Design a protein around this ligand. Sequence first.
Ligand SMILES: O=C(O)c1cc2ccsc2[nH]1
Ligand SMILES: [Mg+2]
Ligand SMILES: [Mg+2]
Length: 706
Amino acid sequence: TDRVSVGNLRIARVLYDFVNNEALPGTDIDPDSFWAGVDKVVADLTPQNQALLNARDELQAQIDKWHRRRIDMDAYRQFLTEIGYLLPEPDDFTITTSGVDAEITTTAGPQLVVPVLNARFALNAANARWGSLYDALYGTDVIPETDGAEKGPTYNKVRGDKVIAYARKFLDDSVPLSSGSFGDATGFTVQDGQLVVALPDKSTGLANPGQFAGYTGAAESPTSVLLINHGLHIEILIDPESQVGTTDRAGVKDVILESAITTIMDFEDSVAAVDAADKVLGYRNWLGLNKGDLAARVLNRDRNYTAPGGGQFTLPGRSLMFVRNVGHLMTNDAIVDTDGSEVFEGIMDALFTGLIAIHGLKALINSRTGSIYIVKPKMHGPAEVAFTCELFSRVEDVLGLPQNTMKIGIMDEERRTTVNLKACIKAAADRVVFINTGFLDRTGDEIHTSMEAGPMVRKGTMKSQPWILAYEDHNVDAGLAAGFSGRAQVGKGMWTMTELMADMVETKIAQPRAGASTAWVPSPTAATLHALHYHQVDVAAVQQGLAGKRRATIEQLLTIPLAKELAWAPDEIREEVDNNCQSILGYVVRWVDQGVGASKVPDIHDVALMEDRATLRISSQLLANWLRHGVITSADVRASLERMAPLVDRQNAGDVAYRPMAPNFDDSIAFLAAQELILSGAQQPNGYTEPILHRRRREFKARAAE
Ligand SMILES: O=C(O)c1cc2ccsc2[nH]1
Ligand SMILES: [Mg+2]
Ligand SMILES: [Mg+2]
């Protein structure tokens, strides 16, 4: 119709044009040979993809019956073994992934995640490798507004001084002088290769002069001083003529931190992309980032420095990029077969994002070691991991890339991956560069998998349940036992409260203390603040100290988060229903009506949260669970949705083109989607929301196409 026929494939025209005209040129790959490659890879791997998806349904159906036909933990576990859910743990091994960049193998630090469909955000992200500590401290609630230090339309000097002080204190804790404090420093010099600091009554150096990494300008009167601690860089910009530098005892203008060492450009949960036009926009942005010519305002270039002993060197000025493809579930009409059946989206993302990423290896650049970094979400168990690897192998042939060029980041966010984590890693032993954990998806799967067992604890309660604490520790243990320390990242989840930076600075330190190589932040600002934690915590030492430990048993992992009988008062029930209905509606309306997958969404208490699509999975699965066991009724669910809808409406009053859901609820496609997600929730595969979401978004767009 409006498609290009290649073999058994009917490629959407926008897609076909985009690959040939934009993606392919530069890659030395023959267009027709590429498309034929696509035709064959799709046909060859599609049935295998389907077999894995069906296998999920079989397991879940068996688990459903088992619960209904009853809690004997020993029998439950033996059952999961019998049905091939819980597979035998392989002997110890060590990953062999080679050609990995240092930012992944060695450097511990923040990792940004940004919706690929947003060129400006994506630009900021790639440039967030370096960010200003002053701007971050002054701009957020880390420095309390309190007494005369409040922000205004004018720069407030009382506040800047607190910022300066905080930064001086940080320098004391990070790169300690052999004597005295940074707060008293009056100047900085470089005599005989060693950084000398000017104190009022004397002069000292770094207690460990190894932390001196270089400088700019002349050794006598430098324009900046480069420091290193825990593999992370710290830059003191010295400029006595600047506004802040003028009033500073040492002429200091700013302190710059190496912040977002890596960034994940996201095709999955932070992006709304339900057809061929959407995917191209995303692919196009991914192309521009990889050719290094995206702009709206360009991509930063490397940074120049002078070695402590005179010579010249350089550091990368951009955030090393991953891409997150979609998982194994969804199809997309960007390609169909002759029968009209949509082609598997994950298979498409491997080919296209992989094709595109070729530009990142030639000059502008990304991986200096020659690798492409794909993060794969929502896999269920080790066979699904081996499938992803086999897919990568094939795509590499179509692209003419050396084998194992396309590295994998295994996200641990499904229960069948959690309890088989060592086997999952081993299936990717020569490609794996990353594992991580998070709250939303994983708890959604937790609730779905045990849907029939009984009513679950409230969402808040989940964060402190035995299963999830065991899962957090188990993740770290498995990676370290597999040799990740020095070879691959071990990550932990997102800080979602974008305006609550004091809290983040206070609490998020627990992640590197738990041995996390990296963890997720929602903004460049956040990345800068979070970098503090890796200065205070020596993650390599922590990881070294954790080795050999088994801090989580299979029994703990399998402890279902069931509510003890009569746990809640009727007002607690309503509070939770309301809370969850608000979460659905707040995220759904922006998603369906505007194709926005990630934004600052006020929760029921007007706190700004930055969650991806998975917030929909947990909240819908919880209410569906509570529906299934009669904690609440259908009258309850609808009443709550009707109450929260105008509240969401009001929270979007500051939106130039928002559309009310109230009072005409059934004419709101957004409202109907929220309602469907909940009432149809128990029947969704593993509780996945995309089937309902994609359809409703496509419906809204067709309604709007008039
Ligand atoms: O895990 C989360 O909550 C999360 C992921 C992403 C990606 C962009 S915003 C965001 N929140
Ligand atoms: Mg997820
Ligand atoms: Mg140390």
